[PDB]
Amino acid sequence: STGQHPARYPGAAAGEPTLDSWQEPPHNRWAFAHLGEMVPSAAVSRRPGHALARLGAIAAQLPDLEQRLEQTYTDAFLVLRGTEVVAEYYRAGFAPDDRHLLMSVSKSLCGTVVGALVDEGRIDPAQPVTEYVPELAGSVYDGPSVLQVLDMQISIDYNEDPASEVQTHGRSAGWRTRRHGDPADTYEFLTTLRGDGSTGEFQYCSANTDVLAWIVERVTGLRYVEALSTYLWAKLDADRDATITVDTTGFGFAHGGVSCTARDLARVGRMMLDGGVAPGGRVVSEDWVRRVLAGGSHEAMTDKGFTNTFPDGSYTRQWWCTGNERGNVSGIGIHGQNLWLDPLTDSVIVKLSSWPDPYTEHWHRLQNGILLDVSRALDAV
Amino acid sequence: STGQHPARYPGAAAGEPTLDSWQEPPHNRWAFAHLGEMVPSAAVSRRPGHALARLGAIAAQLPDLEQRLEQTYTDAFLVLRGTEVVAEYYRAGFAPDDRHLLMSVSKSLCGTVVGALVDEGRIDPAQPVTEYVPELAGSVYDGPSVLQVLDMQISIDYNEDPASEVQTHGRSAGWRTRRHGDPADTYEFLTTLRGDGSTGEFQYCSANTDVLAWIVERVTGLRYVEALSTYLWAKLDADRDATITVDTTGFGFAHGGVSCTARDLARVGRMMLDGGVAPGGRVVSEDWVRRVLAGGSHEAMTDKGFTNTFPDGSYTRQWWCTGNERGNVSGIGIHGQNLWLDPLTDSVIVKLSSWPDPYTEHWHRLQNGILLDVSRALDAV
Fold this sequence. Notes:
Helix content of chain A: 25-40%
Number of helices of chain A: 12
Protein name (chains A, B): 6-aminohexanoate-dimer hydrolase
CATH superfamily of the largest domain in chain A: DD-peptidase/beta-lactamase superfamily
Distance between the termini of chain A: 61 Å
Number of domains of chain A: 3
Largest sheet of chain A: 8 strands, antiparallel
Largest interface: A-B, 72 and 72 residues
Pathway (chains A, B): Xenobiotic degradation; nylon-6 oligomer degradation
Active site (chains A, B): 104
Number of strands of chain A: 14
Oligomer: homodimer
Shape of chain A: globular
InterPro entries (chains A, B): Beta-lactam-related, Beta-lactam/transpept-like, Diverse_Enzym_Activities
CATH class of the largest domain in chain A: Alpha Beta
CATH architecture of the largest domain in chain A: 3-Layer(aba) Sandwich
GO molecular function, one term (chains A, B): 6-aminohexanoate-dimer hydrolase activity
Radius of gyration of chain A: 20 Å
Structural class of chain A: alpha+beta
């Protein structure tokens, strides 16, 4: 009852293959070349224990930086000033070209794909979600515009407990073990969501991003996995593929499931600071980038977890906007992931971490202190 | 009750993380860098529909070769003569550097890791399995020697039906959806296997290979995933990592779950034809390679599915030995996978396929006809 979705391969029936059918024809021709999409899998290294610290260049201004990175459970850290990597750190056991889960930094990538389709004129943010996904009629997404999804200004009953929406979302998508009665896939889960109908106030909700990805699929006919490549990743001249977890229908977990190298993630920030243009072509319009850097409605932003640090902060198009004197904007994910933009110095900071906790005021204070200190260390003196 | 297994990461508790714990500390530091091991995942391509045929060189002697490859559902085909790639074919939609499931060609890789440890003197094939895995006491593997496992000369009640051992094996390992009452992981499944106690006659049984991998783990303390890299893959100077599916404990599906590129698989054959030496060092002893090329006991080989084509054929150390006038030896997997060795011409043939059926006399007749014709086309004239 969630309508048409992109086939896993040319000619594939809806929902095929499953874990129980991938060995059967005609599925197996695709599945034998993509088994990691069906079954958890490990890398067998073609290459035959110590942290790598190359802090520049900025170590002089920040003498305790490595210790501060350790204290915030830093796995990978990279500073790109212009086109140059000017500082790097990787923990023991994490290689420079290893990939790392982005958590909700993934949202900023999804919003970028939406922006690309807006630039092409295939998505109109002013239109209701239901213009593109009619099957969301009767849900909390019946009424709101695509832009309100992009800016997360929809009131939704979404508890952040196995009954909670946050965990149910993960179970529906394959991040956790299914419980009886759980929705079959991410699309079905989204249709179960309800709200009081009010809009205009910021409410951070991961369901919003997956609705964006669903819209992307309905507009392009591409699996979100492929759309993320076609409209973004394949234009970055990246060193490695990214990866994204998929649910049982092959739907990429758009709001949280992307992994990539720190250096490659920085290429996304480089594109944003280059007016939307990447090596392989324009990704989003100059106007789109300008609107991201400008911020969203301040009055909509009532999250004290953000405004206590950034009083004039806001959120738009899947980016957090600090509204600070530097105009910093960042993708953010739980456990300490940031794609942090510092336009003043034409720099991008990537920090990928694994805090023991998904979020505390403690971790965010420390994390933001590092990103701000590093940004300021990049200023001309 | 299956004893000690290699930790998923340094300091990890037994069996941790699971699908339901990987986001929690201390698991998440590892899991965020290896999420594909926990959750099905898709590649997001860094690169922005037609078959590639470069048959040489041998096309003159085999005018209908491409059609014959199409007819046998060929996905990737590569001929390595000496150190030179002299013929290649890839179907539309499969790139030269795409990876392909090996099915039971994986067994020949596992046997190679065992051989490496025999060369080091850490495994004695004459010793009983229980010398290395005491927990297999009380099972069909209580009594037989490691060599009898290597040569698959153990009588086992193993039905090839959800009650059948073949499918139960897959469910225990995560290739299929679990049923209530199923063993928790591959180790537990292996301990459930029984037989009449007789040995000496060939019985092809995939459980044998996973017992070999278990022995490898007990002897080295390494996850089989890592052992496969350390003792084989990392010495090949391969273009890409291989991958291997893992069960819920992280145990690689040794008997069938490896994927790699055709070119890289050929490097394994190159090593065998180079007396056991690879670019990164010796993998197995000269003696081990000699014993593989020599074949196993012919009298043990009573599989008419093999001997009808190869009357003097046999099996040893996880390789099929044709016993034909060319001394051909091959790794073989269902749906048309071969790592085929042609020592006469110092050549390796890789054929990776997706037949609609796992096995029929029809497909094997066609497949072997191609491998033999190609081998003969390589002869000096």
